[PDB]
Amino acid sequence: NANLAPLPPHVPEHLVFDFDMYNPSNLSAGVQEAWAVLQESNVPDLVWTRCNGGHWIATRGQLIREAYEDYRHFSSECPFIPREAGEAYDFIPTSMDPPEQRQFRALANQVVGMPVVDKLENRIQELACSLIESLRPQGQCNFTEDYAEPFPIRIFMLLAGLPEEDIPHLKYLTDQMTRPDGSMTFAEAKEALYDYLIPIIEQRRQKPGTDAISIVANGQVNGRPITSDEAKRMCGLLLVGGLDTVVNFLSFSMEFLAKSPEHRQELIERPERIPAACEELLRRFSLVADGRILTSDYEFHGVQLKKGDQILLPQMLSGLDERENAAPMHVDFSRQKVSHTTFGHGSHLCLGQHLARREIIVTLKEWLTRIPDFSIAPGAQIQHKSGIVSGVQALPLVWDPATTKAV
Ligand code: HEM
Ligand SMILES: O=C(CCCC[C@@H]1SC[C@@H]2NC(=O)N[C@@H]21)NCCCCCCNC(=O)[C@]12C[C@H]3C[C@H](C[C@H](C3)C1)C2
C-alpha cells in the first residue's frame, strides 16, 4: 500500500493521475516546477489523484477560475485535503460560502483592506529597515528565519494591538499549525491557538480599543452582534492568513534574486520597475493550493463530479499555465499582461492582498538599497516543501558587507 485510496466507481481510469500535493515527485527541481507537471500536454484539464484520500485536481487556469467563481457547486465548507483537515477547519470567512460569508468578509475588510494599508505604510517601512540593518554588516543570514518570519508577525501585532513580548509564543502556536511534524492533530493545533485568542477577545468585548481584534470582536453581522466564537474564528484567520504565505513568498522571491544577478541589477538600476516586478514574482512563485467540496452531483467540463467529492483548485497553477502566460517559467519584469490567481479568485479573493503587496514591495526596495549584491551560501542546496502553502525550508544568504550601505 503506497497509501493510494480505492478509485471511486464514478471516476474513469483515463483521468487518474496520482499527484501527491504534500510530496510531489519532482520536488528537488523546485515546487512550482513539481506542480507544473500537471500542465504537460498529455494531462487532462481535470484529473483524479488517489493520494491523500482521493480528490480531483483542476490543472488549468480556465477551470480553476471557473470553479472558484461557482460557490454553489464548489463549497468552502471543506476547503483542505485531506478530508479530515477540511472538516475540522472552521476559520472565518474561509470556511463559509456566500451569502453568509459576505457579512464576515466585509468586517474583515475593515481591518486589513486598502485604507488601513495606505496608513500602515511607514510602520512597515520602519520594520523592514530595522530588520535589514541588523543583518547588513553580518554578511550572512538565514533569510527565512531572520527576515521573512519576524516581518509579517510584527506587522500583525501592530494591526492587532498585541504586545511585543507575545511574539515568541504566537510564533510557536502558529508554527504548530502550519508546519505540522505529525505530533499533533490539526484540530489540536487549532485549539491551542484558540486558547490564546479566547481570553483577549473576552477582554476586548468588555473593554474595546481601536485595534483589529477590538473591531472584529465588537462587529455587527447580519444585523446582530458577532458571537465570541465567530470573533475567535475570524481572528485566527487574520493571524495565520498573512504569516506563512508572506514568509514563504518572500523566501521564493529572495531565492530567485540571489540566483539572478541580472534581475537584481535591473531593479537596482530601475527601482520604478519594483511594483511590476512584485506582480511578476507573485505569478512565477505563486504558492497556495486549497480547494472545495462538491455540494451536489455536477457535470463540469465533461467530467461527472459527485456530491461530497473534494477538488483541489491550486491558485499557483493558473499563472503558470502556458494558456495564460507565454513562456510561464520565465521571469520577465516587463511582461505586459501578467495573469495569475495567486491571491485566489471569486468571493474569497484575498482580503490581505494590498497589505501583502506593500510588504513585498517595501522588502524589495529596502533590501536592494542596502544589500544590492547577495548570493546563496556556497554549496547550500535550497530545499522546498509542498502543501497547502508551499515554501522554502531555509534560505542561507551571504554577501560582502563592503558592497553594502547603511542608509
Ligand atoms: C503572499 C501573500 C498572500 C497570499 C498568496 C494569499 C493568498 C490567499 C488566498 C489564495 C486566499 C483565498 C483562499 C480561498 O479561496 O479559499 C486568501 C484569502 C484570505 N487572505 Fe490572503 N494571502 C496572502 C496574504 C495575506 C495577508 C498578509 C493577509 C492579512 C491578514 C491575508 C488575509 C486573508 C483573508 C482574511 C482571506 C479570506 C477572505 C475570505 O474568505 O473572504 N492574506 N489569501
Ligand atoms: O493541516 C495541514 C495539512 C496536513 C499535512 C500533513 C500531510 S497528511 C499525510 C502527509 N504525510 C505527512 O507527513 N504530512 C502530510 N497542515 C497544513 C497547514 C494548514 C494551514 C491552516 C491555516 N491557513 C489557512 O487557513 C489559509 C487559508 C487560505 C488563506 C491563507 C492561505 C491558505 C488559504 C491557507 C491561510
Ligand SMILES: [K+]
Ligand atoms: K469545515
